[PDB]
PDB file of C-alpha atoms in Angstrom:
ATOM      1  CA  UNK T   1       0.112   0.097   0.171  1.00  0.00           C
ATOM      2  CA  UNK T   2       1.910   3.269  -1.206  1.00  0.00           C
ATOM      3  CA  UNK T   3       1.380   6.132   0.404  1.00  0.00           C
ATOM      4  CA  UNK T   4       2.872   9.730   0.276  1.00  0.00           C
ATOM      5  CA  UNK T   5       2.297   9.861   4.151  1.00  0.00           C
ATOM      6  CA  UNK T   6       4.146  13.384   4.856  1.00  0.00           C
ATOM      7  CA  UNK T   7       7.701  13.780   3.508  1.00  0.00           C
ATOM      8  CA  UNK T   8       8.003  16.041   5.620  1.00  0.00           C
ATOM      9  CA  UNK T   9       8.172  16.351   9.533  1.00  0.00           C
ATOM     10  CA  UNK T  10       9.961  13.279   9.448  1.00  0.00           C
ATOM     11  CA  UNK T  11       7.425  11.077   8.554  1.00  0.00           C
ATOM     12  CA  UNK T  12       9.033   9.911   5.071  1.00  0.00           C
ATOM     13  CA  UNK T  13       6.911   8.221   2.064  1.00  0.00           C
ATOM     14  CA  UNK T  14       6.053   4.676   1.497  1.00  0.00           C
ATOM     15  CA  UNK T  15       8.225   4.119  -1.877  1.00  0.00           C
ATOM     16  CA  UNK T  16      11.519   5.723  -0.514  1.00  0.00           C
ATOM     17  CA  UNK T  17      14.290   3.732   1.494  1.00  0.00           C
ATOM     18  CA  UNK T  18      16.836   4.552   3.653  1.00  0.00           C
ATOM     19  CA  UNK T  19      18.842   6.585   2.339  1.00  0.00           C
ATOM     20  CA  UNK T  20      16.766   8.762   0.434  1.00  0.00           C
ATOM     21  CA  UNK T  21      14.171  11.283   0.681  1.00  0.00           C
ATOM     22  CA  UNK T  22      11.542  13.672  -1.435  1.00  0.00           C
ATOM     23  CA  UNK T  23      13.303  15.334  -3.808  1.00  0.00           C
ATOM     24  CA  UNK T  24      10.723  18.570  -4.424  1.00  0.00           C
ATOM     25  CA  UNK T  25       8.369  19.631  -1.212  1.00  0.00           C
ATOM     26  CA  UNK T  26       7.389  22.695  -2.052  1.00  0.00           C
ATOM     27  CA  UNK T  27       6.353  25.696  -5.021  1.00  0.00           C
ATOM     28  CA  UNK T  28       8.264  28.513  -5.573  1.00  0.00           C
ATOM     29  CA  UNK T  29       7.256  31.285  -8.014  1.00  0.00           C
ATOM     30  CA  UNK T  30      10.431  33.569  -8.094  1.00  0.00           C
ATOM     31  CA  UNK T  31       8.252  36.218  -8.481  1.00  0.00           C
ATOM     32  CA  UNK T  32       9.324  38.682  -5.254  1.00  0.00           C
ATOM     33  CA  UNK T  33       7.373  41.267  -3.309  1.00  0.00           C
ATOM     34  CA  UNK T  34       8.677  45.059  -3.354  1.00  0.00           C
ATOM     35  CA  UNK T  35       7.350  48.111  -1.878  1.00  0.00           C
ATOM     36  CA  UNK T  36       7.754  51.281  -4.139  1.00  0.00           C
ATOM     37  CA  UNK T  37       9.051  54.482  -3.047  1.00  0.00           C
ATOM     38  CA  UNK T  38       7.629  57.366  -0.463  1.00  0.00           C
ATOM     39  CA  UNK T  39       6.323  60.610  -2.410  1.00  0.00           C
ATOM     40  CA  UNK T  40       8.067  63.240  -1.993  1.00  0.00           C
ATOM     41  CA  UNK T  41       6.241  67.140  -1.791  1.00  0.00           C
ATOM     42  CA  UNK T  42       9.254  69.095  -0.384  1.00  0.00           C
ATOM     43  CA  UNK T  43      11.770  68.394  -3.109  1.00  0.00           C
ATOM     44  CA  UNK T  44       9.677  69.501  -5.857  1.00  0.00           C
ATOM     45  CA  UNK T  45       9.151  73.353  -4.464  1.00  0.00           C
ATOM     46  CA  UNK T  46      13.390  74.252  -4.493  1.00  0.00           C
ATOM     47  CA  UNK T  47      14.844  75.216  -7.256  1.00  0.00           C
ATOM     48  CA  UNK T  48      18.540  74.297  -7.565  1.00  0.00           C
ATOM     49  CA  UNK T  49      21.307  76.697  -8.892  1.00  0.00           C
ATOM     50  CA  UNK T  50      24.124  74.064  -9.752  1.00  0.00           C
ATOM     51  CA  UNK T  51      27.495  76.487  -9.576  1.00  0.00           C
TER      52      UNK T  51
ATOM     53  CA  UNK L  19     -13.091  73.232 -19.030  1.00  0.00           C
ATOM     54  CA  UNK L  20     -12.283  74.696 -21.811  1.00  0.00           C
ATOM     55  CA  UNK L  21     -12.381  72.029 -25.017  1.00  0.00           C
ATOM     56  CA  UNK L  22     -14.350  69.247 -25.289  1.00  0.00           C
ATOM     57  CA  UNK L  23     -11.368  66.632 -25.367  1.00  0.00           C
ATOM     58  CA  UNK L  24     -11.765  63.738 -22.820  1.00  0.00           C
ATOM     59  CA  UNK L  25      -8.379  63.954 -21.140  1.00  0.00           C
ATOM     60  CA  UNK L  26      -7.981  67.664 -20.415  1.00  0.00           C
ATOM     61  CA  UNK L  27      -4.133  68.791 -19.434  1.00  0.00           C
ATOM     62  CA  UNK L  28      -5.303  71.627 -16.730  1.00  0.00           C
ATOM     63  CA  UNK L  29      -3.032  74.053 -15.330  1.00  0.00           C
ATOM     64  CA  UNK L  30      -1.352  72.251 -12.899  1.00  0.00           C
ATOM     65  CA  UNK L  31       0.405  69.887 -14.976  1.00  0.00           C
ATOM     66  CA  UNK L  32       1.847  72.370 -16.940  1.00  0.00           C
ATOM     67  CA  UNK L  33       3.220  74.299 -14.136  1.00  0.00           C
ATOM     68  CA  UNK L  34       4.448  70.751 -12.714  1.00  0.00           C
ATOM     69  CA  UNK L  35       6.464  70.213 -15.800  1.00  0.00           C
ATOM     70  CA  UNK L  36       7.217  73.843 -15.805  1.00  0.00           C
ATOM     71  CA  UNK L  37       9.380  73.262 -11.977  1.00  0.00           C
ATOM     72  CA  UNK L  38      10.431  70.027 -13.755  1.00  0.00           C
ATOM     73  CA  UNK L  39      12.336  71.495 -16.498  1.00  0.00           C
ATOM     74  CA  UNK L  40      13.748  74.404 -14.867  1.00  0.00           C
ATOM     75  CA  UNK L  41      16.587  73.022 -12.534  1.00  0.00           C
ATOM     76  CA  UNK L  42      18.721  72.072 -15.587  1.00  0.00           C
ATOM     77  CA  UNK L  43      17.746  75.444 -17.367  1.00  0.00           C
ATOM     78  CA  UNK L  44      18.983  77.208 -14.508  1.00  0.00           C
ATOM     79  CA  UNK L  45      22.216  75.181 -14.393  1.00  0.00           C
ATOM     80  CA  UNK L  46      22.709  76.343 -18.103  1.00  0.00           C
ATOM     81  CA  UNK L  47      22.563  79.954 -18.140  1.00  0.00           C
ATOM     82  CA  UNK L  48      25.462  80.127 -15.520  1.00  0.00           C
ATOM     83  CA  UNK L  49      27.699  79.069 -18.182  1.00  0.00           C
ATOM     84  CA  UNK L  50      25.838  82.441 -20.584  1.00  0.00           C
ATOM     85  CA  UNK L  51      26.568  84.688 -18.058  1.00  0.00           C
TER      86      UNK L  51
END
């Protein structure tokens, strides 16, 4: 009765032997999470004088 | 609203463009001076 059991938490699968384990146990999206810049209100006011 | 365009510019956009383009022009005029 080949059961999947739970590879993580140590309860190896039925098919797996004494020296091996499941190669892949999760899926990774590869699309990270980012945050945008904080808005500026005082910089647009100033006029520069690049001497 | 002066015109019938679906998307109208309004004065704030133009003033923002002027203030954004001013910094390079101000730095340029020092050389001509």
